[PDB]
Amino acid sequence: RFLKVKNWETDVVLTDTLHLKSTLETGCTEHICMGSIMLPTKDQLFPLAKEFLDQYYSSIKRFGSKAHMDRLEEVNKEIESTSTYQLKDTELIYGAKHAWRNASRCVGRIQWSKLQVFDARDCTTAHGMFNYICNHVKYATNKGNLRSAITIFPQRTDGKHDFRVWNSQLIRYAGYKQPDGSTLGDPANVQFTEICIQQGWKAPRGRFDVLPLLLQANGNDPELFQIPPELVLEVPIRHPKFDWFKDLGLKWYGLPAVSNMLLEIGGLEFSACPFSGWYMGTEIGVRDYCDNSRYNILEEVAKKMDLDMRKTSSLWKDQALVEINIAVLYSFQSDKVTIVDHHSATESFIKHMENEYRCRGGCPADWVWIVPPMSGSITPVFHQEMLNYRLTPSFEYQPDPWNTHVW
Amino acid sequence: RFLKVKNWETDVVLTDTLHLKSTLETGCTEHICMGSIMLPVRTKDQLFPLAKEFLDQYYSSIKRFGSKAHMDRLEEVNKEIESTSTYQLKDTELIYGAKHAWRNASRCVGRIQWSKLQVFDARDCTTAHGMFNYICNHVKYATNKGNLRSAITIFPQRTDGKHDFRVWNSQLIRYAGYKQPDGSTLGDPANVQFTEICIQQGWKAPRGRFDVLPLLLQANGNDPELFQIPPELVLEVPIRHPKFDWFKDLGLKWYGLPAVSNMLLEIGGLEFSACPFSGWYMGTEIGVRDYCDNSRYNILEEVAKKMDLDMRKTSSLWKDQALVEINIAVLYSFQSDKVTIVDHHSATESFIKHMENEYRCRGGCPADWVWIVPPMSGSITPVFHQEMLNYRLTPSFEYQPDPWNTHVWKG
Ligand code: HEM
Ligand code: HEM
Numbered sequence: 001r002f003l004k005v006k007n008w009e010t011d012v013v014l015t016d017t018l019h020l021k022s023t024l025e026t027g028c029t030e031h032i033c034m035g036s037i038m039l040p041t042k043d044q045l046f047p048l049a050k051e052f053l054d055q056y057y058s059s060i061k062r063f064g065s066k067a068h069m070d071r072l073e074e075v076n077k078e079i080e081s082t083s084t085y086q087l088k089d090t091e092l093i094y095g096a097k098h099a100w101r102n103a104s105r106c107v108g109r110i111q112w113s114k115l116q117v118f119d120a121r122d123c124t125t126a127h128g129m130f131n132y133i134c135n136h137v138k139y140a141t142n143k144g145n146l147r148s149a150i151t152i153f154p155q156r157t158d159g160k161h162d163f164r165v166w167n168s169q170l171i172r173y174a175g176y177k178q179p180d181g182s183t184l185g186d187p188a189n190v191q192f193t194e195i196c197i198q199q200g201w202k203a204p205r206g207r208f209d210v211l212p213l214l215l216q217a218n219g220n221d222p223e224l225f226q227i228p229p230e231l232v233l234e235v236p237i238r239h240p241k242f243d244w245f246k247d248l249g250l251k252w253y254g255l256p257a258v259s260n261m262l263l264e265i266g267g268l269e270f271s272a273c274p275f276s277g278w279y280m281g282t283e284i285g286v287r288d289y290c291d292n293s294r295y296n297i298l299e300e301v302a303k304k305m306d307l308d309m310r311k312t313s314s315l316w317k318d319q320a321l322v323e324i325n326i327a328v329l330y331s332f333q334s335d336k337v338t339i340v341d342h343h344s345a346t347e348s349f350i351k352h353m354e355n356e357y358r359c360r361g362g363c364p365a366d367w368v369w370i371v372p373p374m375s376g377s378i379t380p381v382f383h384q385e386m387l388n389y390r391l392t393p394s395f396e397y398q399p400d401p402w403n404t405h406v407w
Numbered sequence: 408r409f410l411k412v413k414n415w416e417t418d419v420v421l422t423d424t425l426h427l428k429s430t431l432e433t434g435c436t437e438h439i440c441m442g443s444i445m446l447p448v449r450t451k452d453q454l455f456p457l458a459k460e461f462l463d464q465y466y467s468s469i470k471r472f473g474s475k476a477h478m479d480r481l482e483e484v485n486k487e488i489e490s491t492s493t494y495q496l497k498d499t500e501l502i503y504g505a506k507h508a509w510r511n512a513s514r515c516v517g518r519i520q521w522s523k524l525q526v527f528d529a530r531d532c533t534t535a536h537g538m539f540n541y542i543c544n545h546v547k548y549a550t551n552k553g554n555l556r557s558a559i560t561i562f563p564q565r566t567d568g569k570h571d572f573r574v575w576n577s578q579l580i581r582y583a584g585y586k587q588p589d590g591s592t593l594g595d596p597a598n599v600q601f602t603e604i605c606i607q608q609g610w611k612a613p614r615g616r617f618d619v620l621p622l623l624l625q626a627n628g629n630d631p632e633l634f635q636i637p638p639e640l641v642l643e644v645p646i647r648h649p650k651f652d653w654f655k656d657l658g659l660k661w662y663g664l665p666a667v668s669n670m671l672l673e674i675g676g677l678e679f680s681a682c683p684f685s686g687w688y689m690g691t692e693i694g695v696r697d698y699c700d701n702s703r704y705n706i707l708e709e710v711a712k713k714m715d716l717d718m719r720k721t722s723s724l725w726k727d728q729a730l731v732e733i734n735i736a737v738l739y740s741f742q743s744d745k746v747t748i749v750d751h752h753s754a755t756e757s758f759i760k761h762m763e764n765e766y767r768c769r770g771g772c773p774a775d776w777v778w779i780v781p782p783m784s785g786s787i788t789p790v791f792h793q794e795m796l797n798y799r800l801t802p803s804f805e806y807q808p809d810p811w812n813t814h815v816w817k818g
């Protein structure tokens with residue numbers, strides 16, 4: 001019930017008490033670990049509201065205060081009447097920052113308290129949403145000096161009036177299926193690029209076409225909007241040693257801005273809550289470029305380096321992978337766009353873990369996601385035992401809108 | 408209950424019914440996942456259900472479930488337990504048990520080979536000298552002049568836990584570690600504690616960087632004894648790089664035979680506390696972990712210097728770059744000397760096929776993702792994208808405490 005975690009490279013042992021506050025379920029049982037599975041009303045409402053409000057007022061040294069009790073009273077009265085309730089601005093900000101703080105799969109949580117929260121709860125239309133989103137993008141991008149931000153659209157009411165951003169990220173390249181049988185652009189987005197076309201989009205059918213936004217307000221049909229090109233900061237990808245690298249014609253966008261998740265605070269459900277930080281190099285270099293069901297460029301890069309691709313034991317894929325990742329970092333840095341390498345970020349996370357254990361009693365962490373997709377054991381997180389559990393407020397997964405939307 | 412797993416690179420979805428035959432606990436609960444935690448005397452009372460369950464499995468596998476041979480064997484074991492508080496396995500049972508323990512080892516990427524395992528029955532052994540002889544033969548047989556063969560040597564089962572056979576080495580072949588008065592470590596830092604024990608027990612240490620450790624063997628619960636593996640039996644490989652000629656000057660070598668000796672084999676409730684087993688190396692065990700862990704030989708810097716990588720900023724990925732070259736050199740060296748080894752791409756690829764085969768033929772394959780995924784280049788191997796269900800089946804290999812922490816000294 002009081003758990004210890006060991007770092008095996010350093011023998012440091014932390015004691016986790018925070019997990020006893022965990023509420024939601026992991027998917028695992030005593031008979032089975034699902035640690036590597038991708039996705040494992042008024043009486044419902046008030047305890048949830050109460051538990052959140054309890055942690056809020058404790059966090060501001062006002063637990064058991066008149067202001068505390070008043071707010072509990074007040075929210076309880078609002079729930080009784082409206083069947084929902086509204087967060088005070090302060091609570092909204094705490095809630096958001098804490099959803100990040102609790103995101104067990106996030107290696108960048110050391111930055112969690114420095115999140116810019118944009119209250120977009122007065123929004124009523126997709127045009128409105130578009131405006132809020134352009135502002136988020138410009139603010140977050142900041143001419144390459146990235147700043148973390150989240151924009152929070154109105155909370156779910158009766159599930160018929162949901163706000164949803166249909167894109168999985170605010171910025172992402174298109175994916176088209178060729179008669180050739182292959183795939184042009186980003187294969188991860190083939191279906192979404194289709195639904196854009198189905199709903200009107202004029203695709204330039206290229207390899208790196210920034211997708212249009214597909215915005216859904218109040219449960220209405222979603223609408224297309226093109227982000228101002230001048231707001232989409234992109235980095236051309238070159239290598240600091242191989243001049244042929246530029247000829248591969250690769251680029252990536254500076255702003256990772258996840259738009260498809262669900263923010264839960266005090267039982268309230270924010271279906272449209274796009275948030276953004278900045279890239280860890282491997283997200284692009286390892287996953288986006290080298291995953292087989294993505295840009296899958298490994299073969300071509302290797303061939304250009306003239307490595308022995310005959311036997312896998314030449315570790316040519318490994319060599320190419322390293323070089324590709326060197327280039328991603330080199331390009332971003334040269335263009336003064338914020339980026340962190342997998343060594344710095346994992347080392348930062350270890351310090352953060354130690355802070356959370358020391359100041360909060362622990363830190364929920366999903367090893368399967370925290371360890372970078374390359375060079376795993378030469379990063380400190382590899383040797384770090386982690387406890388995974390679900391705290392609230394949280395970011396949750398939610399079904400893709402097209403499978404849901406009552407057209 | 409049926410459980411599905413998905414490969415997110417291929418969209419293959421498999422169905423697990425095998426987890427239903429799971430008993431032992433995972434460490435996990437509905438409120439906490441302990442999936443990345445490294446480590447999360449038995450009465451006649453608890454012994455017969457364990458025996459029966461095993462014997463039920465064994466006889467299914469040979470398509471004799473419910474036959475008279477099956478029933479009589481259950482009878483015989485039943486009686487033998489109430490009479491002797493334990494029982495003995497038939498040779499067939501031991502062999503089946505050993506293979507299935509490997510097959511059930513959820514952290515082993517090498518399980519495609521599970522059915523081909525040479526079982527050495529050392530249950531007639533009584534003394535440490537007898538142990539040394541058995542081990543020597545294991546080493547010679549498994550080595551096979553570089554053409555490695557999986558083998559396991561099974562010494563006598565636990566009785567009262569007061570007469571245990573134990574191999575005090577974590578591996579049959581492993582390099583000495585020496586702490587120096589200045590804080591630095593000479594040799595393998597992983598073995599400083601065991602090295603010290605050996606030294607105290609009479610071992611004359613050469614005090615070099617790659618001294619092969621002596622066998623420290625415990626028979627029947629008596630104090631352990633030192634034995635030197637004949638050098639001619641210890642196959643080693645000098646490490647060089649195919650393009651880099653300075654690499655040989657790094658003075659590196661490794662032993663060819665990975666032979667794990669500190670685990671406990673459990674079969675039908677019976678506990679085998681000394682069951683050394685051996686296969687062959689996946690290149691990353693040496694090249695990534697043994698050479699490059701900060702707490703091991705830790706050669707990344709020295710290799711990086713020699714490569715003249717930009718080492719001032721970690722965003723140069725000089726570490727990643729040096730790691731790859733070392734792993735290249737490890738594979739090249741072994742292949743050049745015709746010592747069996749497998750790269751992490753081949754091994755993970757084989758594991759996916761094995762695992763699929765296991766779902767089809769067996770209804771599942773327990774697998775520990777945290778361990779299965781290679782410690783370099785994780786996502787460019789197919790296992791990274793594979794969902795896995797982890798659970799514990801018997802027969803199994805279990806951890807046990809280091810014998811020096813539990814041994815009662817005779818003098
Ligand atoms: C500022 C620098 C940040 C860095 C370097 C970073 C890093 C990462 C990385 C590498 C992942 C793995 C994701 C993948 O492989 O697809 C991840 C996941 C995640 N991040 Fe962070 N992140 C940052 C900011 C943020 C912010 C601002 C938020 C929310 C306010 C956030 C919330 C999350 C969540 C919820 C996940 C897991 C999502 C899932 O379960 O699929 N991160 N992060
Ligand atoms: C024949 C070629 C084999 C290969 C390539 C192989 C590969 C591996 C690797 C790379 C590991 C992870 C090691 C680590 O990181 O510490 C492992 C773990 C393991 N292997 Fe295999 N193995 C082989 C044969 C065997 C055999 C013959 C047995 C037993 C009869 C076995 C049983 C196990 C067990 C029980 C573990 C888990 C160790 C633990 O929990 O600490 N393997 N294997």
Ligand SMILES: C=NCc1cncc(OCc2ccc3ccc(N)nc3c2)c1
Binds near residue numbers: 277278280283
């Ligand atoms: C697509 N992979 C699974 C998945 C599903 N749904 C959302 C996901 O987002 C990952 C994610 C989330 C937030 C991030 C913030 C910053 C950053 N650099 N990467 C980040 C990556 C990932």
Ligand SMILES: C=NCc1cncc(OCc2ccc3ccc(N)nc3c2)c1
Binds near residue numbers: 689
């Ligand atoms: C010390 N490291 C953890 C550890 C503890 N106790 C036993 C271990 O065994 C690892 C292991 C076990 C069996 C193997 C068989 C073949 C192989 N190539 N590596 C293998 C590696 C590992």
Ligand SMILES: C[C@H](O)[C@H](O)[C@H]1CNc2nc(N)[nH]c(=O)c2N1
Binds near residue numbers: 368370794
């Ligand atoms: C099957 C496995 O759970 C899946 O591939 C996970 C593994 N770890 C990951 N880790 C990160 N950071 N991102 C991912 O998308 C994944 N995918």
Ligand SMILES: C[C@H](O)[C@H](O)[C@H]1CNc2nc(N)[nH]c(=O)c2N1
Binds near residue numbers: 443
């Ligand atoms: C904390 C963590 O469980 C520990 O470092 C694990 C990670 N995965 C591993 N995987 C393998 N194959 N071998 C190991 O020793 C480890 N160590």
Ligand SMILES: [Zn+2]
Binds near residue numbers: 033
């Ligand atoms: Zn688990």
